[PDB]
Input
Amino acid sequence: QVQLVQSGAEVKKPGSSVKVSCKASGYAFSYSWINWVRQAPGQGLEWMGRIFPGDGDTDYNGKFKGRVTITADKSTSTAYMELSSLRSEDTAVYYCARNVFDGYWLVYWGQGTLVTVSSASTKGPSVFPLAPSSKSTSGGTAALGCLVKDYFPEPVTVSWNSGALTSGVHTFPAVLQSSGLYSLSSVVTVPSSSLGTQTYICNVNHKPSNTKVDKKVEPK
Amino acid sequence: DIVMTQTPLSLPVTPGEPASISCRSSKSLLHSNGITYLYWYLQKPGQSPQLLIYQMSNLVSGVPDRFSGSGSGTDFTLKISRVEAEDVGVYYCAQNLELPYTFGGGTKVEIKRTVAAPSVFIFPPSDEQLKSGTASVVCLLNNFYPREAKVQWKVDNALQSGNSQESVTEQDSKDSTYSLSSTLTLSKADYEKHKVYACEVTHQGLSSPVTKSFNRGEC
Output
């Protein structure tokens, strides 16, 4: 019944600090090494350090040059990881992992904790229609979607017809740009023969800014 | 720092067939105890990494015996006798023989299927965005395979550069196809200087490049 539950997502301004919790259960907390591993978006795994709660012993990775401080609270079986002087490159998922003596390195992992680092301010997105059309040509089968643009921070959720339309839908991973803002599109292919029968609406939900918008994508 | 080097960076596999991933360490990961400290981790899509093989050849409980780990001095290898659709994800190799602990770049395992040409659609800027002073043009490459694809924008037959950004879906679990969007951004004013906006696609499934375009302000 071993389990590792980390704290929720975090959004921090550059130069600031973050402290991620790692609640452990199901084993003798004091006698297993807690390791911390990070993962920048679309990139590999990075060993950050380790702590032995039983004696507070800690080891770190040199690259972080002291910007990392690992602590452990025996009374609550919780391990902490504090990053200092945050920069954009520190934007990543942070995992806590538990060892089991006799070779079982990093056998248990937490669900991960997302930390995004930018100076952008919370903002709801603009929602534009990607209208279906064609007229002549050929290949009879229509594409339509929604341009969800200029929002911060992640994530945004998109559905179609309030969930009724799931087949054919493709919601692309958001891309960050020169502005602090994100942007993405949600597209779906349907029978072009149906543009006159089925009303299509994209349901954009941006929790961080409490923004919800339903945009109808009509032909033209 | 004991460097870990993995190959290939990407590895498509056909369900039922074999599959292998190679890892290489700068130093010898063997110890006096006899135990070699090489570890294989699998990160399934959207999930946290999970220990797959510990100390070179040891199978973690629950790992299908189809998986197996071997190695020789500094050359290590992960084998999947036959591949399941559930073995997809990024495989990382790592060492805990020396501080600081290090990983390999990882190997992204995906399902290899028959080539499929992209269906291409282009989207003019909505009039709503235009009144906002900006024009985004979207070209959609839908349900294709493999992932590799060249998408270039031509404006009045003039090839663009740095003017666009693309984003790609992850392999669909139903048909193993991908989807790519290439967005072009312009000023409302820079957009009304030109007439023909084209999206030209090159792909393994197309005898020759396929171009989809439109003339501004007219449908």
Observations:
- The helical segments of chain B are 127-131, 188-191.
